[PDB]
Design a protein around this ligand. Structure first.
Ligand SMILES: [Zn+2]
Ligand SMILES: [Zn+2]
Ligand SMILES: [Zn+2]
Lengths: 787, 46, 115, 299, 196, 105, 57, 69, 124
């Protein structure tokens, strides 16, 4: 008959911490993008991001300064003995303490009390290959203590039930997601980054002021490797009618003609490039001239480059120094190495045909933007972005440090061969001598990142900023603490801009980014907080079975069709252009896919899949069927009207989707979905605010900041802590007036206030606008007392 | 006005213009004796 | 060339009825999914324009027809392998494509929209 | 005003008081007569028919709006359009094509491997006219303009066999929005707003008093206001500039409904005009001050 | 904070005319005679032309805003104070606004009548490339609510669509307080040093 | 309108190979067909005095789509169906097999 | 502060004898000035007041 | 932490009524309201005191650095 | 195959050079030394139209079916509240709302008169 508080249930759970599944699953679902992100570093298919990362950094070559002595012109060309060093596997151990002999388990409570770091032993199988594997030497090298995330894959608490956690001096429903570094709990802040594997048509005045006769128009795709490392490729339209390919290696930008990078990927004719960009719209005079400028320009500048091999050799010759790929690597090898490491890396190696098709599509999208056929894509909008999770960022910098680690081994060998010469690479003694003369403490390097937030890297990753990647998981009260793990920042670089569009609350954020929960002043609209039911993608699956479903639904293969433009629908799966269809059929496929998606009868179509359909419009967004399944995606649950079942929606696909708020507001022929509860669009703290639909907008916002600054309960396991400073309310009380989500997050474990007899009265004369009166006899009785 | 040494030591010109300058920070404005600071509270009885 | 490995040359090739007289000849191209069996169906219902309906063992299909490069290679003889079709290059008279269509259910508004 | 005493104001304006004998239609026609007119504003379509024969032939057809349409919207005649194309536009177009040929032959392409900076049937009178224009232009062959109706302008451009491919439409487009039909110096647009406190006025988006002095039949030359202090000082003197400072500072406060006593503004203005010039409250204005200690404690 | 049964009837009746206003203004800027339906194919094509241009959208926003704000003014003029249950001097909320003790009749009207049109940077609510102002509303919806016009009051509560739109306009002010490089510190310092 | 089928051939016979827009060729050269043994992949190869033709089947398209070519009769209203694989064909020239030193300066 | 963004500093710790006393015999723990609400428009607190009282009884 | 001694508002002893309240909810199976009435809490200030009490002390006590396990 | 101003090979698909740059009566492909032309390729022409968005003007705006500009006075101030005018004494008075300063600070009201047209600024 009511929406009561659990009193009998609460007190029983306080005495008896459950031995089964922990209560309040939403609390663990809040730290799901943090724990999940770090879990994918070792566990999951393909052996985790860290094993994929060392598989992508590859070998590091150095040659011995010794002759061949063969009975010859070979002697002069002989570089010596080859030494290719790499890392096959990467291991992480749960925190242990050795005393030199037998190891003992070290729990988080110990690390906090000891004022030390909760580190796990980092191991990595080093490969010492000589003369291209004529003799291989393996050694599992201990690379220091890597700080491990709490309640994760490599934490001692992940299996533990509420009872076990209390017996191990932790909170009954301990969330985790943070790192204990020198006694300080530090977390990796989530970042808003460009949506992976999608060509974005952007107008930027910045592009013009860089080079000669450069326009505002351009295309930008953020290609991501399976190890989560990113590599952005940019297309520029010059006023000459020339198209240039922009990229980054080390920390320098490089420009190459697009017709050169196209001919390097696969053997094609000039007409194959023509058919690839210009479809049946051959009569478009605007396109007819622009493409002639590209093809004739390439023929004028490079008349010698007449085949795929010559192009690769010319590319290899000019990039042999920057890519450091030398001195036995041919210009054909270096050329291909450039392509495999720079051009559309999301499609990866053995997918040059796929890279060629995607590149032609980017040129057509670029020409549609110049003409005006296509409106520019907004990077600041939620639809054209994803969320770089902490664990993924941690894995990226780890991959960077192991690349540095291999570079250091070569540096030691280069020092050795440039002086005393020492001995050969086949001797294990020499390997052991080199290895202990190299700084192998990657754990300290990773401990530095978690202790300063400063990004020290040779590439600088695909990020703009270099600081503030890590923040102290402030436990002044639980409300502030739980909000940290739901907080997302656009970037430190964006905070120093006169643009207000970035800070503006947009409709694209509906159900993903909370409209209330944002700070006042400088972090307003920059330091956002996600919705309580919003989730972030940890990996992808069944993605390989979807092209088979699409081709069967009438999708004509891109390799046979040869027709491109905004006049036809382009079908893509994680940036992989698979085919071509009509815009009429394009929606039919998009609607029928969603139907078999929610139905548990189809094995190859996952419910978490994003079906981004873009209908054709008059000077609107570039049309197509851009499907997504990959990591970092923003996802939220909604009720799908036919079948009456749950459906997962992304911010890209939502823009054209008609989702009613309440079931009574469903309009015929113009609605496909409905919300479960409108409370799904707000944060945890925003939902906790009583009758927020009766308060003025900035007061609801200020409450989030207030509840964060309140002297409440920072925890109950304080007698085993040693934090800088803690604020504890002695007499905590359960709210009579409360949202039911207060119980769903078990906020009664950490009371933030007290129920007081409040009279709206002007009586004393000391209370006026910003001043309020407290009762003396109440204060004397311990009301609002804190320590 | 001196050659680069492998931040240099400030000269007497730098001492007079450290930030706002000696004239602005210690002549036009000064820290004073017989003064106090506190949070203000309202009172209708005074 | 000779490469790749595991590939054997096609010696025997079946006869193709190609004449192109004048009461005239027509060459058709059809696209089909891997789920349907071609040897099972002995009759295909097809009419002009995009409008088409087909049902083969619970599964529903639609035959998309379009007026309008692909090159047809017809075998002149089994020993002559394959050669480009010509009359005076050659193009298909009519091009068709079979697309699997699913019936999406109508929203039960009387059951979902509740005051 | 106060801090920089800028001679180059962001929005320089002129308030022109119109007489009573000049009607609302006459004043709007006058606004059009002074407003800067560009070739872009009268053109509807440009069709370039690039044909390569024998020589790159470029048939540029200028499809303008109807003669009565732009004459009622910009106060521009067909005769006015003829003079601009035959004297300015062709000379500007020829210079742009020559520059584009040089730019094509200069840099063949970007340097690979080298690092670039980071992101972050014709009449007799018509024939004599065409022949005279051919003698004044090095690349044109034909020039026919609609003299009766006044709707189009067609002209043929002949280029060498070595000139090869070129984007003429984009080249033409840029020169059209750069070509001025009629412009009164330093003035961009003259508009007719709602009468300010009962006063019939015209607000100019530029400053040139001597040009407005010639429009005595429309404007009361003894009441022509301007926000630009330096421009007022140059033409009307220090006391006029002084009066502009007290009025302009008052406009800044009156807009935000803030009342500041004129005793303050008059003092500020008198201090800025103490040297008979327009001095600002900064290092430059301060140079003429007796106290070196006051100067030392500023910067 | 309460209106009388008589006063609340007036509120619902004036706000009943606001549904037509959305399409009426949309039909005026687009230039269409006899007032074409909300689902008209030519009207929807005409509204798209407006969506792609910053100036054209401005004309649409300013016309629709002036028309819905006229409906707001009517509600407020009728319901306050002749429709309020408790009246001055006893209605303390009303008393504080009239006395000048704290608040105004504008705040009082948002509490007891309606929030009105949520204005963002001089215009209405921002609209997506799809022509949708929210995923809940129809693409190129010719309704006042879709544009940000809140019929709800803080006493009765505000709908989720209205809540999100209020969140936009509410934050918009705080964003301006964050992006305001203009300071009166140096301006005054330059005058005082020369005029001391 | 139900159209009847006379015969269906599941054996290799006739094939289709897409080149580019505006392909003529000498129309006297031969194309050697190849096969690999669930789904069979086909490879096309031709030779000329100045040119050379190479074709193959798309791995993602073969397992998902099955292409067929048929001959229609205007009076009998019967179609003779024959399975035809689509081969993505590229043409290499005499200019190919040209390269400089593996390492230059 | 209440859960409606109505923060205020403690102006004084008023004695219960000097505090206004209810018909029930209760004197408020906290006193909020009525002049806070017309500008902030925190009606959520107003409904929270009669809800909290109903739930306590 | 533990049940407060005396009601913050009036001063009526509430500390002796915490364990007795849980017994009226468990054994007697009464509702929240009737249980408080039987304890002698009629003022809503005294009513909320026990009704709204969390009792985090039982959660706090489970961490004892003086006894093993 | 010839398209617009572009001339492509039928055998390989390479873009053939302009007939004016190379030697007379005969043109040859760079890939294979193919025999061309046929003289039937003709003097190629391309009809390139203007962008239409390239010339933004007041007249181009008057050619738009939707309203592009507002009239001199045909735009009335909608928001009106009953408030005593401090200028002389009027009932009808316009208003504007915006949340200035911190999230703790109140809302500022911007009043406007209808009889004269005088702006205003007062928080409370
Ligand atoms: Zn009591
Ligand atoms: Zn050729
Ligand atoms: Zn007045």
């Amino acid at each position: 008959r009511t929406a009561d508080f659990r009193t009998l249930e609460r007190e029983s759970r306080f005495i008896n911490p459950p031995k089964d599944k922990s209560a309040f699953p939403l609390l663990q679902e809040a730290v799901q993008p943090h724990i999940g992100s770090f879990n994918a570093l070792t566990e999951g298919p393909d052996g985790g991001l860290l094993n994929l990362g060392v598989k992508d950094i590859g070998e590091k070559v150095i040659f011995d300064g010794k002759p061949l002595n063969s009975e010859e012109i070979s002697n002069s060309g002989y570089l010596g003995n080859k030494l290719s060093v790499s890392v096959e596997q990467v291991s992480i151990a749960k925190p242990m303490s050795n005393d030199s002999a037998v190891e003992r388990k070290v729990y988080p409570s110990e690390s906090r009390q000891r004022l030390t770091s909760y580190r796990g032993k980092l191991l990595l199988k080093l490969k010492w290959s000589v003369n291209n594997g004529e003799e291989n030497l393996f050694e599992v090298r201990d690379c220091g203590g890597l700080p491990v995330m709490l309640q994760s894959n490599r934490c001692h608490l992940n299996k533990m039930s509420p009872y076990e956690l209390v017996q191990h001096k932790e909170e009954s429903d301990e969330i985790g997601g943070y790192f204990i570094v020198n006694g300080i709990e530090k977390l990796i802040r989530m970042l808003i980054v460009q949506r992976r594997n999608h060509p974005m048509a952007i107008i930027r005045p910045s592009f013009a002021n860089r080079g000669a006769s450069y326009s505002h128009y351009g295309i930008q795709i953020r290609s991501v490797r399976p190890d989560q490392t990113s590599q952005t490729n940019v297309l520029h339209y010059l006023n000459d009618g020339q198209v240039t390919f922009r990229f980054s290696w080390r920390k320098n930008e490089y420009l190459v003609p697009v017709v050169m990078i196209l001919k390097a990927l696969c053997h094609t004719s000039d007409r194959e490039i023509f058919d690839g960009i210009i479809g049946n719209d051959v009569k478009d005079s605007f396109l007819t001239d622009r493409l002639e400028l590209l093809l004739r320009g390439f023929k004028k500048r490079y008349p010698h480059l007449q085949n795929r091999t010559q192009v690769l050799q010319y590319l290899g010759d000019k990039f042999r120094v920057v890519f450091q790929a030398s001195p036995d690597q041919s210009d054909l090898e270096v050329g291909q190495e450039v392509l495999d490491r720079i051009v559309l890396v999301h499609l990866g190696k053995d997918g040059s045909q796929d890279k060629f098709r995607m590149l032609l599509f980017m040129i057509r999208k670029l020409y549609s933007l110049v003409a005006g056929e296509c409106s520019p894509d907004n990077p600041d909008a939620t639809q054209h972005q994803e969320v770089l999770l902490g664990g993924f960022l941690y894995g990226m910098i780890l991959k960077e440090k192991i690349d540095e680690y291999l570079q250091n081994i070569i540096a030691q060998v280069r020092m050795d061969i440039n002086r005393g010469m020492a001995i050969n690479f086949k001797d294990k003694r020499y390997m052991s001598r080199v290895l202990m003369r190299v700084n192998e403490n990657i754990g300290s390097k990773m401990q530095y990142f978690l202790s300063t937030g400063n990004l020290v890297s040779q590439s600088g990753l695909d990020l703009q900023q270099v600081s503030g990647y890590t923040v102290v998981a402030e436990k002044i009260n639980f409300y502030r603490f739980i909000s940290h793990f739901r907080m997302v920042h656009r970037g430190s670089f964006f905070a120093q801009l006169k643009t207000t569009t970035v800070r503006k609350l947009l409709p694209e954020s509906w159900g993903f980014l909370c409209p209330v929960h944002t700070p006042d002043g400088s972090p307003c609209g920059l330091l956002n907080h996600f919705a309580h039911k919003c989730r972030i993608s940890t990996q992808q699956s069944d993605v390989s079975r979807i092209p088979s479903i699409l081709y069967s639904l009438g999708v004509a293969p891109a390799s046979h069709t040869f027709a491109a433009g905004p006049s036809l629908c382009c079908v893509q799966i994680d940036g992989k252009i698979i085919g071509w269809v009509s815009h009429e059929q394009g929606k039919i496929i998009a609607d029928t896919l969603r139907y078999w998606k929610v139905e548990g009868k189809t094995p190859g179509l996952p419910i978490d899949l994003e079906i981004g359909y873009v209908p054709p419009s008059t000077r609107g967004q570039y049309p197509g069927l851009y499907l997504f399944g990959g990591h970092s995606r923003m996802l939220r649950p909604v009720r799908y009207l036919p079948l009456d079942k749950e459906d997962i929606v992304g911010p890209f696909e939502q823009v054209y989707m008609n989702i009613a708020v309440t079931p009574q507001e469903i309009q015929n022929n113009v609605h496909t979905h409905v919300e479960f509860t409108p409370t799904n669009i707000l944060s945890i703290l925003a939902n906790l605010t009583p009758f927020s639909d009766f308060n003025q907008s900035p007061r609801n916002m200020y409450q989030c900041q207030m509840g964060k600054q309140t002297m409440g309960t920072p925890g109950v396991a304080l007698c085993h802590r040693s934090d800088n400073k803690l604020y504890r309310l002695q007499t905590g009380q359960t709210p009579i007036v409360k949202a039911n989500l207060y119980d769903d997050y078990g906020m009664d474990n950490f009371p933030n206030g007290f129920n007081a007899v409040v009279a709206v009265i002007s009586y004393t004369g000391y209370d006026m606008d910003d001043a309020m009166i407290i009762n003396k006899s109440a204060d004397e009785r311990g009301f609002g007392y804190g320590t | 006005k001196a050659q680069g040494r492998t931040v240099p030591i400030p000269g007497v010109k730098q001492a007079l213009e450290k930030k706002e300058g000696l004239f602005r920070k210690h002549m036009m404005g000064k820290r004073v004796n017989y003064a106090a600071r506190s949070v203000i509270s309202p009172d209708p009885n005074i | 060339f000779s490469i790749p490995d595991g590939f054997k040359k096609c010696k025997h090739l079946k006869n193709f009825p190609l004449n192109g007289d004048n009461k005239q000849q027509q060459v058709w191209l059809i696209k089909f999914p891997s789920n349907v069996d071609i040897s099972k169906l002995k009759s295909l219902p097809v009419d002009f324009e995009s409008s088409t309906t087909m049902t083969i063992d619970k599964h529903d299909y639609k035959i998309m027809d379009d007026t309008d490069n692909m090159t047809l290679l017809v075998p002149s003889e089994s020993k002559e392998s394959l050669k480009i079709a010509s009359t005076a290059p050659l193009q298909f008279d009519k091009v068709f494509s079979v697309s699997e269509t699913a019936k999406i259910p109508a929203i039960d508004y009387s059951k979902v929209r509740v005051p | 005003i106060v801090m920089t005493a800028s001679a180059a104001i962001k929005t320089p304006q002129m308030t022109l008081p119109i007489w009573n004998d000049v009607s609302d239609e006459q004043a709007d026609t006058f606004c059009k007569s002074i407003s800067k007119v560009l070739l872009s504003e009268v053109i509807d379509k440009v069709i370039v028919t690039e044909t390569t024969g024998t020589a790159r032939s470029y048939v540029i057809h200028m499809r303008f709006f109807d003669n009565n349409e732009y004459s009622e919207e910009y106060d521009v005649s067909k005769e006015e359009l003829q003079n601009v194309i035959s004297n300015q536009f062709i000379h500007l177009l020829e210079a742009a094509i020559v520059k584009e040929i040089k730019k094509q032959k200069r840099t063949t392409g970007p340097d690979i491997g080298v690092a670039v900076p980071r992101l972050q049937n014709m009449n007799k009178v018509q024939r004599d006219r065409q022949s005279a224009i051919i003698s004044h232009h090095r690349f044109i062959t034909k020039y026919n303009f609609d003299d009766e109706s006044g709707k189009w302008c067609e002209f043929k451009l002949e280029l060498a066999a070595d000139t090869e491919k070129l984007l003429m439409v984009n080249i033409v487009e840029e020169i059209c929005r750069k070509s001025i039909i009629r412009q009164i110096p330093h003035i961009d647009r003259c508009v007719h707003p709602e009468p300010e406190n009962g006063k019939r006025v015209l607000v100019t988006e530029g400053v040139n008093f001597q040009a407005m002095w010639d429009q005595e039949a429309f404007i009361d030359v003894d009441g022509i206001t301007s926000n630009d202090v330096a421009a007022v000082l140059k033409t009307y003197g220090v006391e006029a500039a002084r009066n502009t400072i007290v009025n302009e500072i008052n406009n800044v406060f009156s807009r935000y409904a803030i009342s500041v006593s004129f005793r303050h503004l008059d003092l500020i203005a008198d201090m800025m005009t103490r040297q008979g010039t327009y001095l600002a409250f900064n290092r430059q204005g301060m140079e003429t001050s007796t106290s070196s200690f006051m100067k030392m404690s500023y910067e | 904070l309460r209106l009388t049964a008589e006063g609340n009837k007036w509120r619902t009746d004036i706000l009943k005319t606001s549904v037509d206003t959305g399409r009426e203004a949309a039909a005026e800027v687009t230039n269409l005679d006899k007032d074409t339906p909300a689902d008209d194919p030519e009207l929807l094509k005409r509204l798209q032309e407006i969506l792609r241009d910053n100036n054209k959208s401005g004309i649409l926003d300013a016309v629709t805003s002036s028309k819905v704000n006229a409906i707001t003014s009517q509600v407020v003029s009728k319901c306050v104070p002749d429709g309020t249950m408790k009246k001055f001097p006893c209605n303390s909320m009303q008393a504080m606004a009239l006395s000048g003790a704290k608040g105004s009749n504008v705040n009082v009207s948002q509490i007891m009548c309606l929030l009105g049109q949520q204005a963002l940077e001089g215009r209405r609510v921002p609209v997506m490339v799809s022509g949708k102002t929210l995923p809940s509303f129809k693409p190129y919806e010719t309704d006042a609510m879709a544009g940000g016009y809140v019929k709800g009051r803080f006493y009765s509560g505000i709908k989720p669509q209205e809540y999100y739109f209020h969140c936009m306009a509410g934050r918009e002010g705080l964003i301006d307080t964050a992006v305001k490089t203009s300071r009166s510190g140096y301006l005054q310092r330059c005058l005082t040093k020369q005029l001391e | 309108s139900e159209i009847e089928i006379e015969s269906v051939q599941d054996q290799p016979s006739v094939a289709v190979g897409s080149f580019f827009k505006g392909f003529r060729a000498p129309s006297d050269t031969t194309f050697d067909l190849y096969k690999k043994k669930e789904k069979d992949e086909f490879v096309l190869h031709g030779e000329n005095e100045r040119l050379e033709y190479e074709g193959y089947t798309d791995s993602s398209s073969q397992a998902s789509n099955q292409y067929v070519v048929g001959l229609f009769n205007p009076e009998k209203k019967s179609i003779q169906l024959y399975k035809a694989p689509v081969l993505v064909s590229k043409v290499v020239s005499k200019s190919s097999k040209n390269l400089r030193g593996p390492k230059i300066k | 502060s209440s859960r409606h963004g109505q923060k205020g500093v403690c102006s004084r710790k008023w004695p219960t004898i000097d505090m206004p006393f209810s018909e029930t015999g209760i004197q408020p723990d906290i006193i909020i000035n009525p002049h806070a609400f017309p500008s902030r428009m925190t009606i959520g607190m107003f409904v929270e007041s009669l809800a909290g009282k109903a739930g306590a009884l | 932490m533990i049940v407060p001694v005396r009601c913050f508002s009036c001063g009526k002893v509430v500390g002796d009524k915490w364990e007795s309240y849980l017994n009226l909810l468990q054994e007697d199976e009464l509702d929240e309201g009737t249980a408080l009435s039987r304890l002698g809490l009629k003022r809503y200030c005294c009513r909320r005191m026990i009704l709204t009490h969390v009792d985090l002390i039982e959660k706090f006590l489970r961490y004892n650095p003086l006894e093993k396990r | 195959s010839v398209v617009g101003s572009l001339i492509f090979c039928l055998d390989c698909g390479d873009l053939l050079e302009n007939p004016n740059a190379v030697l007379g009566s005969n043109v040859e492909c760079s890939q294979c030394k193919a025999i061309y032309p046929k003289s039937q390729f003709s003097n190629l022409k391309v009809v390139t139209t203007t962008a239409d968005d390239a010339f933004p003007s007041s007249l181009r705006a008057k050619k738009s079916v939707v309203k592009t500009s507002l009239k001199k006075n045909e735009l009335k101030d909608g928001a009106t509240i009953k408030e005593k005018c401090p200028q002389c004494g009027n009932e009808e008075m316009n208003y504007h709302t915006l949340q200035l300063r911190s999230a703790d600070e109140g809302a500022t009201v911007f009043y406007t008169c209808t009889s004269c047209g005088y702006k205003f600024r007062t928080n409370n």
